[PDB]
A paper describes a structure:
The most abundant flagellar building block is the flagellin protein that assembles in a helical pattern of more than 20,000 copies to form the extracellular filament. Successful assembly of the flagellar filament relies on the FliS protein that prevents cytoplasmic aggregation of flagellin10 and guides flagellin to the cytoplasmic side of the fT3SS. Therefore, FliS acts as targeting factor directing its flagellin client to the export gate of the fT3SS for subsequent secretion.
Crystals of the flagellin/FliS complex were obtained in two spacegroups, the primitive monoclinic space group P21 at 1.5 Å resolution and the primitive orthorhombic spacegroup P22121 at 2.1 Å resolution. Notably, residues 46 to 57 are kinked by 45° in the orthorhombic structure, while the helix is straight in the crystal structure derived from monoclinic crystals. Apart from this difference, both structure superimpose well with a r.m.s.d of 1.5 over 329 Cα-atoms. The crystal structure suggests that the flagellin/FliS complex forms a rather compact particle detectable also in solution by small angle X-ray scattering (SAXS). Contact area 1 involves the C-terminus of flagellin (D0-C) wrapped around the surface of FliS in an extended horseshoe like conformation with a mainly hydrophobic interaction area of 1600 Å (Contact area 1). Contact area 2 aligns FliS to the D1 core domain of flagellin, a region that was not present in previous crystal structures. Taken together, our crystal structure shows that the interaction between flagellin and FliS involves a complex interface at flagellin including the D1 and D0C domains.
Numbering used by the authors:
A (entry chain E): 13 to 122
B (entry chain D): 46 to 102, 106 to 304
Write the structure that this text describes.
């Protein structure tokens, strides 16, 4: 669209929102018994979490706990995929919502 | 960023093996979900065959046969349309062929710890003409497949009539039900092997990221999520320095 426009903080916010969107699409696919659709969206969500983790400046102290959460989020999404566990998806959706809401406030108050 | 950049190269192998195992499990779950439908349709077909064997009302027989023929056509549709990434799973593309191995196609999965041990997997034809009473070899003789069911023949033949009597046609459905159940169970065993691979891959990645494998359970993750969320709020500049390091063309690609 018009991405080169977005600031670095706005780019990260876009990633959090996309991750949530793909998790919600995968939960819906599980309800509709669409395995291929569920798998495609959870891998999309996993790729976002891994991109966030691998773009952490690990000289910054905050990066340790954020990356530990990303590692759990990735592992939990893999388990939810192979187990068709919407409950697990709702769990990871809550974490990403936590990160998304705090991040959106952080770029504002800055 | 360089510390995180090489951590990508360390676990790139584990991530791609994890994606392959996820893909393989979802392929099998796709086949198992379709086989569950075929099994349920076969159960309904058996109900109609039994009802036809106990009906003395032949236009009742024709109406029952119309439903059966539509149901076996549903079975054909499932076997012909079930797909994963464009690969036909249940139409016999991947059936075993011991009579002519040159014509056999295999599904390949990677199994075991480290996901490097390849296995070959076959899936039998699940169409209506491939389910029923099998001969010594893989073949189904005439009038012995689910596609051959015709309960209107019950009006002119005793129940013990060979091939077309009620008892014989009921046997065709029973054998077909078990054939679908056997195919689903064999695919479940493969799924189990891929699950064990995923858990060994995760344990391998957990060891290589010590102090980033730190979160164990739901209680820790819940509590760490709230703690990290409040640290992001309280240290906005540190949060920007820590995470706002994506390049725009990578973001557009991930959001497709």
């Amino acid at each position: 669209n018009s991405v080169n426009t977005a600031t670095p903080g706005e780019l990260t916010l876009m990633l959090y929102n996309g991750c949530l969107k793909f998790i919600r699409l995968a939960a819906q696919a599980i309800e509709n018994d669409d395995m291929e659709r569920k798998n495609e969206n959870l891998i999309k969500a996993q790729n976002i979490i891994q991109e966030l983790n691998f773009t952490l400046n690990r000289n910054i102290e905050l990066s340790a706990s954020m990356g530990a959460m990303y590692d759990y989020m990735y592992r939990r999404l893999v388990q939810a995929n192979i187990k068709n566990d919407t409950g697990m998806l709702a769990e990871v959706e809550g974490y990403v919502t936590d990160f998304r809401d705090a991040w959106k406030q952080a770029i504002q108050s800055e | 960023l360089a510390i995180s950049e090489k951590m990508r190269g360390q676990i790139r192998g584990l991530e791609m093996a994890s994606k392959n195992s996820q893909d393989g499990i979802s392929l099998i779950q796709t086949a198992e979900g379709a086989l569950t439908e075929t099994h349920a349709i076969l159960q309904r077909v058996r109900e109609l065959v039994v009802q036809a064997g106990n009906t003395g009302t032949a236009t009742d027989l024709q109406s029952i046969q119309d439903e059966i023929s539509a149901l076996t056509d549903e079975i054909d549709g499932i076997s012909n349309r079930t797909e994963f990434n464009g690969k036909k799973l249940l139409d016999g593309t991947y059936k075993v062929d011991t009579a002519t191995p040159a014509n056999q196609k295999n599904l390949v999965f990677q199994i075991g710890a480290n996901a490097t041990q390849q296995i070959s997997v076959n899936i039998e034809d699940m169409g209506a003409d491939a389910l029923g009473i099998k001969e010594a070899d893989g073949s189904i003789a005439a009038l012995h497949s689910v596609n051959d069911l015709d309960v209107t023949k019950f009006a002119d033949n005793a129940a013990d009539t060979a091939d077309i009597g009620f008892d014989a046609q009921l046997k065709v459905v029973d054998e077909a039900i078990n054939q679908v159940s056997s195919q689903r169970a064999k695919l479940g065993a493969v799924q189990n092997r891929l699950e064990h691979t995923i858990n060994n891959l995760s344990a391998s990645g957990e060891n290589l990221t010590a102090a980033e494998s730190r979160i164990r359970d739901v209680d820790m993750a819940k509590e760490m999520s709230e703690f990290t969320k409040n640290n992001i709020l309280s240290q906005a500049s540190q949060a920007m320095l820590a995470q706002a390091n994506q390049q725009p063309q990578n973001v557009l690609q991930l959001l497709r």
